[PDB]
Structure formats: structure tokens, C-alpha cells
From TrEMBL, chain B:
TM region positions: none
Organism: Homo sapiens (Human)
Ranges of residues in domain SH3: 1-57
Name of the protein this chain belongs to: Src substrate cortactin
Compartment(s) of residence: Cell junction, Focal adhesion; Cell membrane; Cell projection, Dendrite; Cell projection, Dendritic spine
Length: 19, 57
């Protein structure tokens, strides 16, 4: 097959240190 | 002004963060945090997952 699922995405649950 | 579209579906696990889907493009998107952004959904202001979204030209 010439089709493969994309790699894992980076941590998105992270949150800024200061508003 | 500024438009932004998401890659995949994500759930805003915060108090001031909103969720969006790939087929749901939002406007008025700015970058407040070096890792996070801000998204507006028809007036609904919130946070835009920089890891699950992208700023459109």
C-alpha cells in the first residue's frame, strides 16, 4: 500500500506559563 | 481579518479554551503565547491549540 497514517502530533494539552 | 483552520479534532481542556474541527474554520486568530494562540468562533473568543491548529494567510 502506498498510503500510511500520519505521525503522532506533539503534546497539545500544554498550557502557557503566563497570560 | 485573520483566518485559521484546524488539522484534526481537539477538545479544549481548559477554562478559557474552545474546541474546533478541521471542517470548522475560525477567524480573528492571534498568537498570545509562544506555544498557544487565540481563536474566535462567530464572536466566541477563546484559546486556539497551536498544536492542533494553524494560522491561515
Amino acid at each position: 500500500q502506498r498510503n500510511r497514517m500520519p505521525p503522532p502530533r506533539p503534546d497539545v494539552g500544554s498550557k502557557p506559563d503566563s497570560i | 481579518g485573520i483566518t485559521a483552520v484546524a488539522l484534526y479534532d481537539y477538545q479544549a481542556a481548559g477554562d478559557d479554551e474552545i474546541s474546533f474541527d478541521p471542517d470548522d474554520i475560525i477567524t480573528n486568530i492571534e498568537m498570545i503565547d509562544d506555544g498557544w494562540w487565540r481563536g474566535v468562533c462567530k464572536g466566541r473568543y477563546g484559546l486556539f491549540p497551536a498544536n492542533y491548529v494553524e494560522l491561515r494567510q
